[PDB]
Amino acid sequence: ALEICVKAAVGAPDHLGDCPFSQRALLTLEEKSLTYKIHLINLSDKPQWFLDISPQGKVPVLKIDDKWVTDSDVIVGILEEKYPDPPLKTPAEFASVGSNIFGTFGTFLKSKDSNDGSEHALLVELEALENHLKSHDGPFIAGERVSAVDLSLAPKLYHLQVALGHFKSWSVPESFPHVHNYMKTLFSLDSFEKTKTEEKYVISGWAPKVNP
């Protein structure tokens, strides 16, 4: 069968954890309506069988054919080639929409210096997603149907909402109504609902990382 290893929740290794790249792969398995086993991996106490098949011990990892494959980009493109219907290819022109939101969200989340410009850098990336969404037909980045870019982005936007909300009482401003609407569209996908990390465990996941 297809099998996939993903991060288990910090403080709760019997529940699904908060890895956005793992969630991207789960989302793709679901949107293809494929059958798979999940192995929840405790990253602080990593079983031996798992290391024999993932050298660096990183997740996500997908077993396809009799090969264990890392790298969420690779994983989702192998799935697209092997199971072409329903297709999830995003037109190349839009495949990078939103690509810097996750990075600028992380930097802003971590900041304790109100003047380092990190907020503004995030706002500029949201702004750019807003400009795409308002000028192109939706509900998804490439129109009527969900595609690869939406599945890469959904877990990252969830993290942003949940983490900035919890840690900073901060929300995407009201002045990005397309971004809010797009986030609602993504979080009410059946695939998203089925694969989402409980909010608890996005918080437990981020808590040790907000301050070095």
Curated annotation (Swiss-Prot):
Record-listed S-glutathionyl cysteine modification sites: 19
Notes on the domains: May change from a globular, soluble state to a state where the N-terminal domain is inserted into the membrane and functions as ion channel. A conformation change of the N-terminal domain is thought to expose hydrophobic surfaces that trigger membrane insertion.
Signal peptide: none
Gene disruption: observed consequences: Plants react normally to ozone.
Induction section of the entry: Induced by jasmonic acid (JA), oxidative chemical stresses (e.g. norflurazon, menadione, paraquat, and antimycin A), and during photosynthetic operation in the light. Also up-regulated by insects such as Pieris rapae in a JA-dependent manner.
Membrane topology: Peripheral membrane protein
Positions annotated as active site in the UniProt record: 19
Gene3D superfamilies noted in UniProt: 1.20.1050.10, Glutaredoxin
Residues involved in L-ascorbate binding: 7, 18, 209
Quaternary state and interactors: Monomer. Interacts with copper (Cu).
Motif (Copper-binding): 132-136
Extent of motif Glutathione-binding: 19-24
Pfam families associated with the record: GST_C_2, GST_N_2
Keywords: Cytoplasm, Detoxification, Glutathionylation, Ion channel, Ion transport, Membrane, Mitochondrion, Oxidoreductase, Peroxisome, Plant defense, Stress response, Transferase, Transport, Voltage-gated channel
One function term, GO molecular function aspect: copper ion binding
Protein EC: 2.5.1.18, 1.8.5.1
Any Gene Ontology CC annotation: chloroplast
Primary gene name: DHAR1
Organism superkingdom: Eukaryota
Domain GST C-terminal, first and last residues per copy: 83-212
Name under which the protein is recorded: Glutathione S-transferase DHAR1, mitochondrial
